[PDB]
Amino acid sequence: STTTNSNSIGRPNLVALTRATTKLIYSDIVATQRTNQPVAAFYG
Amino acid sequence: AEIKKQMEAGALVEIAEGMATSIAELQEGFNGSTDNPWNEMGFRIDKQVIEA
Amino acid sequence: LIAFDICGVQPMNSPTGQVFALRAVYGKDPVAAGAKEAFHPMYGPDAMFSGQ
Incomplete structure (x- = not known):
């Protein structure tokens, strides 16, 4: 009367891996241009 | 120990035997028979774990 | 050394197998x-398990 109660198991199938991260939305919010100096200065 | 002494002395002798056809043939209720199950066997499968 | 001529190895590819x-x-x-x-x-x- 061998059943699944007898069988021992090696390891589970992960099936999936999830990471919980913020959707980062700033690219569409802030106009921007790289600075190539330690200081930036904008003209009005 | 006592069983071995009687065995060695010939009072008790190892034996094995087959089964009458008339019993085995209907084993498990054939022809309306009853109270006659088969002997059964299986396997288990267990495990040991080693920490590194 | 005696190496492992006298042991099993079965190297791990994950710790604690x-x-x-x-x-x-x-x-x-x-x-x-x-x-x-x-x-x-x-x-x-x-x-006598499967027999008498």
């Missing part, structure tokens, strides 16, 4: 107190 083992067991329930190993090397078989 495990080993399974299979015993053939008779007496209906493979998992039960008193169930017996079918091919145990020291203990003889029940010579």
Whole structure:
């Protein structure tokens, strides 16, 4: 009367891996241009 | 120990035997028979774990 | 050194691995107190189990 109660198991199938991260939305919010100096200065 | 002494002395002798056809043939209720199950066997499968 | 000429190795590819083992067991329930190993090397078989 061998059943699944007898069988021992090696390891589970992960099936999936999830990471919980913020959707980062700033690219569409802030106009921007790289600075190539330690200081930036904008003209009005 | 006592069983071995009687065995060695010939009072008790190892034996094995087959089964009458008339019993085995209907084993498990054939022809309306009853109270006659088969002997059964299986396997288990267990495990040991080693920490590194 | 004696190396490992006298040992098993079975190197790990993940720390803390495990080993399974299979015993053939008779007496209906493979998992039960008193169930017996079918091919145990020291203990003889029940010579009458499938017979008389």
